[PDB]
Amino acid sequence: CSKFLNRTIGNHWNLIENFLLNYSIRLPPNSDVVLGDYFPTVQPWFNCIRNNSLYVTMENLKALYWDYATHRQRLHVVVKGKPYSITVTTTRNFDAAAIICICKGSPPTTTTGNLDCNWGSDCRLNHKFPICPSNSQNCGNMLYGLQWFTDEVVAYLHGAIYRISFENKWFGTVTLLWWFNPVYDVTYYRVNNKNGTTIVSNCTDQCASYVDN
């Protein structure tokens, strides 16, 4: 299928807020800043659910985010590039340690098995992790995703960031209960850390005119 079930984040916007709350931890104790990145957005959320030889494709994107709805089966995500590709494979054991690999070879478009990493060589990342935080089902209360930059890949998992550095040419091509949010451009948010509690707000109109480049 192709990009079936087009919905906004709606009442689940708090997932985006939480993402920004974790992202902004690195800021100084006394600052008011506007952060711009390929942040998860609010409009293009998809649930393409229209045989294990079929898959969904996407093109020309720079970051990919997804969420877990709350029958539970499996997810397969491939980000193409050269010499390295990124593959994420999940398994039905939500309370035990999905796998993420960054390697050299040719990932499959579909997977029938589980938790392996033999599609390539000279790997930089080979990491096993639980699908649900703290092995509980506390699941579907945060976003997961990838941002692929030429210099490094940053993986967002369980509120934590994993940064894997290596030179790579990335392609915008991506091959895929789970909801997805393709990200194509930069979104700006204002973060106020003066109060003692960080406050995250949208920057879309008059302030946007001062930061949007």
Ligand SMILES: *[C@@H]1O[C@H](CO)[C@@H](O[C@@H]2O[C@H](CO)[C@@H](O)[C@H](O)[C@H]2NC(C)=O)[C@H](O)[C@H]1NC(C)=O
């Ligand atoms: C940032 O803008 C989005 C809209 O693009 C706001 O999202 C709305 O949030 C309310 C309350 O959660 C929902 O009822 C609406 O359905 C949302 N509309 C959407 C998703 O388009 C969001 O609340 C704004 N955030 C801030 C801090 O202003």
Ligand SMILES: *[C@@H]1O[C@H](CO)[C@@H](O)[C@H](O)[C@H]1NC(C)=O
């Ligand atoms: C999803 O809806 C938006 C409007 O909110 C539209 O611009 C976009 O092209 C739609 N995408 C698909 C695959 O229907």
Ligand SMILES: *[C@@H]1O[C@H](CO)[C@@H](O)[C@H](O)[C@H]1NC(C)=O
């Ligand atoms: C991420 O933010 C959430 C929501 O604010 C918070 O509960 C959690 O402790 C944070 N996790 C971190 C610091 O990685």
Ligand SMILES: *[C@@H]1O[C@H](CO)[C@@H](O)[C@H](O)[C@H]1NC(C)=O
């Ligand atoms: C954050 O601001 C609100 C008012 O909008 C205030 O009630 C709250 O106590 C402040 N947080 C802290 C840690 O002071």
